[PDB]
């Protein structure tokens, strides 16, 4: 199951459905048959045995998120939107049975980010349907991050087509420029690695910022060059090569515009890339045999990548593959006590009214953050502590 959990998930789906049909025929709601159902699914499925000695326990309940990712990810011939919906419908029913739904929204949000920003998402219309279904489960606050991620994808799509119209009124760009503006505070991505923009891509850069100054006022742009790709062609080789590479590989290849060979130190100094990231980029470039060094007999494994080796562009590049693509991926217990203490005096309190009375009354030490207090109050009301009102507004009450 650990090696190939793909078919492990499919086993659970088939077993559950057939159990209901057999009972209603002759058993007539037998006491013994119904009782044995709740004991088998809980212990055997929710937490399996091999999660203990394999030092991997958090990943076990998280294999459901990747299953739904595979259905909405760009792949080969996929099932049509006629039989897939009904299988997803019963998935919602079993989802409420799990208690740690918070981690579900985290992993699905991170996986959705990589699917959308890289244009690897399939059936984008169906993606809105999937997120809409998750909204009904808990609320818009539960899917607050997810909805914003999908919204800015549509905004950027209309922004690019509006940018094309703006290009006709000015000098046409020598390259096709498309950009996902994304958003700050709603995405897992963040700028971490500094980068020197190549002189070829600067002008378009500036152009776009102008388009983002007239359209939007008081808005910055934190470009993520590690998440940007592009297509680069060669006009001096024997054959035309339209390679697809990230911004880092693009800059490394474009550095050979003026010369033929460079050392690692000059590459590091000119592009200001960190040692580890640049080492990984150089290694994956060497895997594609795009750049070679003087000594073929030298082994890259037992010889450290010292920042002095002179790598030269291989002018007789005749690699047998015409489809080169180097763009492949490389305990506190204080807040619960405070909550019960503040609910002692006031029998009935709103959720947000209770927040602040505990969130920031003791904020001078151990700033608690909203989600921690939400989770603690959830595990409290679960264990016969708050027993919130049956639906009248959002009062949480006490022993009522």
């Amino acid at each position: 199951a650990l090696n190939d959990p793909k078919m492990y998930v499919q086993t659970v789906l088939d077993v559950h459905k057939k159990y209901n049909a057999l009972v209603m025929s002759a058993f007539n709601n037998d006491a013994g048959f119904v009782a044995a159902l709740d004991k088998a699914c809980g212990r055997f499925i929710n937490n399996n045995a091999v999660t203990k000695m394999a030092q991997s326990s958090s990943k076990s309940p998280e294999l459901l998120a990747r299953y739904c990712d595979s259905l909405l990810k760009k792949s080969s011939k996929n099932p049509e939107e006629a039989e897939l919906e009904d299988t997803l419908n019963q998935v919602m029913v079993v989802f409420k049975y799990i208690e740690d739904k918070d981690v579900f929204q985290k992993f699905y949000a991170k996986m959705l980010a990589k699917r959308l920003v890289h244009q690897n998402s399939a059936s984008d219309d169906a993606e809105a349907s999937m997120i809409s279904k998750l909204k009904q489960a808990c609320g818009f606050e539960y899917t607050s991050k997810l909805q914003r991620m999908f919204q800015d994808i549509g905004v950027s799509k209309d922004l690019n087509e509006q940018f094309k119209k703006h290009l006709t009124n000015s000098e046409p760009l020598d390259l096709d420029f498309s950009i996902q503006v994304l958003s700050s505070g709603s995405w897992p991505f963040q700028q971490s690695c500094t980068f020197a923009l190549p002189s070829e891509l600067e002008r378009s850069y500036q152009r776009f910022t102008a388009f983002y100054a007239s359209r939007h006022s008081g808005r910055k742009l934190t470009w993520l060059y590690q998440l940007s790709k592009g297509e680069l062609v060669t006009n001096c080789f024997k054959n035309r090569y339209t390679l697809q590479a990230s911004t880092f590989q693009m800059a490394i290849l474009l550095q050979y515009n003026t010369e033929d060979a460079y050392t690692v130190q000059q590459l590091t100094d000119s592009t200001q890339i960190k040692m580890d990231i640049l080492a990984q980029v150089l290694q994956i470039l060497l895997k594609s045999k795009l750049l070679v060094l003087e000594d073929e007999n030298a082994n890259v494994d037992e010889v450290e990548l010292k920042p002095d080796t002179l790598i030269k562009l291989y002018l007789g590049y005749k690699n047998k593959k015409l489809r080169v693509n180097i763009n492949v991926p490389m305990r506190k217990l204080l807040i619960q006590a405070a909550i019960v203490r503040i609910m002692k005096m006031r029998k009935v309190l709103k959720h947000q009214q209770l927040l602040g009375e505990v969130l920031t009354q003791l904020s001078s030490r151990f700033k608690p953050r909203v989600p921690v207090i939400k989770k603690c109050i959830d595990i409290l009301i679960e264990k016969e502590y708050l027993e919130r009102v049956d639906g009248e507004k959002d009062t949480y009450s006490y022993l009522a």
Partner: protein
């Protein structure tokens, strides 16, 4: 196989502006393509981009029947719809009534038989926007009724798109009775993820119907939401809900400067909303002398549209009331003519107030 990998790059990277040569090579691609590959559509799109300019319409009717079939299964939904938008948008201003009329008739019937769920829904909505912008409200209703009658919840995204189209059409019809019903209908939908342009028409007419009725607080919430969504997507209409945002904020007994949030601060000094910025800066910290001067100077920027002229009577009276209340605070006996000189109104009007 081996030749498919090599030939496609040669015919794509090399633009081959010379005609009567690249046509033959691309023709062999479609017939020889046996596998269920995506590369067939990409080369097939090139002839539409280049050879469409050089007439050759009789050639295209023969090739159009099999063109739509590849959308279903050869490529994904996102790629098929993306290629359509670029070509169709720029030919709208190119006139060609003889092309636009006959193309839509034959395409709509063929696509209806195959796709009904989502691909047909968006294309028909796009055509509905075309009817809306052409000021032709005689054939939008027929396609709107068939769009609306698809349910009889779980389809909130599609329902809100229809409601936005109805609201936009009735705005041009000068209809107010239907606007109330449409806005309340959208309130029952709580599971929609629409574009931030769809929820800028529903949330703008909701603020306007609240403005007319007299609920200035609910209008402020609707105008803030509409302005925020118009800021994310859109531009020309964004600096129209901001003016109504400030006016609604002045009609809720003031309080809190609208130009303090991060969304409205950059547009505070914009020339279009500069007059309203000074209006709210004078409404708060009540001073009638400055408030009246701004109204007199910016007569063609404030007292122009009926949505602000009508409510200018409610203003210039609340600010006068607040000045009056503060003025009479430290007095046990005051002169009515003395009040009139401070309020800049007649003695008879002071007694009525």
């Amino acid at each position: 196989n081996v030749d498919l990998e090599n030939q496609y790059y040669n015919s794509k990277a090399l633009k081959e502006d010379d005609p009567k040569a690249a046509l033959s090579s691309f023709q062999k691609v479609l017939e020889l393509e046996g596998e269920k590959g995506e590369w067939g559509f990409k080369a097939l799109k090139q002839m539409i981009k280049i050879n469409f300019k050089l007439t050759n319409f009789p050639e295209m009717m023969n090739r159009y029947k099999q063109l739509l079939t590849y959308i279903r299964s050869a490529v994904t939904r996102n790629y098929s719809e993306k290629s359509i938008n670029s070509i169709l948008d720029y030919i709208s201003t190119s006139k060609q009534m003889d092309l636009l009329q006959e193309f839509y008739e034959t395409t709509l019937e063929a696509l209806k038989d195959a796709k009904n769920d989502r691909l047909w829904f968006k294309t028909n909505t796009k055509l509905g926007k075309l009817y809306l912008e052409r000021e032709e409200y005689g054939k939008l209703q027929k396609i709107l009724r068939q769009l609306h009658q698809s349910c009889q919840l779980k389809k909130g995204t599609q329902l809100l798109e229809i409601y936005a189209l109805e609201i936009q059409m009735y705005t041009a019809q000068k209809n107010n009775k239907k606007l109330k019903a449409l806005y309340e209908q959208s309130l029952h939908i709580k599971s929609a993820i629409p574009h931030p342009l769809i929820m800028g028409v529903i949330r703008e007419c909701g603020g306007k119907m609240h403005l007319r009725e007299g609920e200035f607080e609910k209008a402020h919430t609707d105008f803030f939401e509409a302005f925020k969504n118009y800021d994310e997507s859109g531009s020309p209409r964004r600096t129209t809900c901001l003016k109504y945002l400030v006016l609604a904020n002045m009609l809720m007994k003031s309080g809190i400067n609208p130009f303090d949030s991060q969304e409205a601060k950059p547009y505070k000094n914009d020339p279009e909303i500069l007059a309203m910025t000074n209006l709210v800066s004078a409404y708060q910290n009540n001073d009638i002398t400055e408030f009246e001067k701004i109204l007199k100077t910016n007569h063609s920027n404030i007292m122009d549209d009926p949505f602000i002229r009508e409510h200018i009577e409610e203003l210039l009276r609340n600010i006068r009331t607040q000045v009056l209340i503060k003025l009479i605070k430290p007095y046990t006996r005051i002169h009515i003519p003395f009040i009139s000189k401070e309020l800049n109104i007649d003695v008879a009007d002071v007694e009525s107030l």
